[PDB]
């Protein structure tokens, strides 16, 4: 009985709406450009178009639910999980002090488009606060991610 991996694909369905602010089922270089500024800056509608062209399975000019998933598994495979972790940590550590912070976690979730209480941010720290210092250090951050 060779089962499938559709269980993981369900998670990407719930994340797709977060990336598509219009909830119309498709993301356009203009919409994603807002996320790029939050990471550092906005690319260019010319260059943004080339990125979608290599991932456009149909060639319509936009990324659909099934097209977005194929690119995700293709990028991580040719890349290493160690590389995506280093990039994500650097994005959360805006002040670059060695660890994150309650204010650092809340700034990204709100910037992403989700509303949570300050208590919601504190618990996130508890999950990676093995030493009990109230802050997540670099070592605690990687261990919790590769715990299993």
């Amino acid at each position: 009985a060779d089962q499938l991996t559709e269980e993981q694909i369900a998670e990407f369905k719930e994340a797709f709406s977060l990336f598509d602010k219009d909830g119309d089922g498709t993301i356009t270089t203009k919409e994603l450009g807002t996320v790029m500024r939050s990471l550092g800056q906005n690319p260019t509608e010319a260059e943004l178009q080339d990125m979608i062209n290599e991932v456009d399975a149909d060639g319509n000019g936009t990324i659909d639910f099934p097209e977005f998933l194929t690119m995700m598994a293709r990028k991580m495979k040719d890349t290493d999980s160690e590389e995506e972790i280093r990039e994500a940590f650097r994005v959360f550590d805006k002040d670059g002090n060695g660890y994150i912070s309650a204010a650092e976690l809340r700034h990204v979730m709100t910037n992403l488009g989700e509303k949570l209480t300050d208590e919601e941010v504190d618990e996130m720290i508890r999950e990676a606060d093995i030493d009990g210092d109230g802050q997540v250090n670099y070592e605690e951050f990687v261990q919790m991610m590769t715990a299993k």
Binding site: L39, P43, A88, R90, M145
Partner: peptide
């Protein structure tokens, strides 16, 4: 939502800007 699940999506943000 699990904290580990959120980290996977963050890694995708920098890769998109890589190219």
């Amino acid at each position: 939502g699990g904290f580990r699940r959120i980290a996977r999506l963050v890694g995708v943000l920098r890769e998109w800007a890589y190219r």
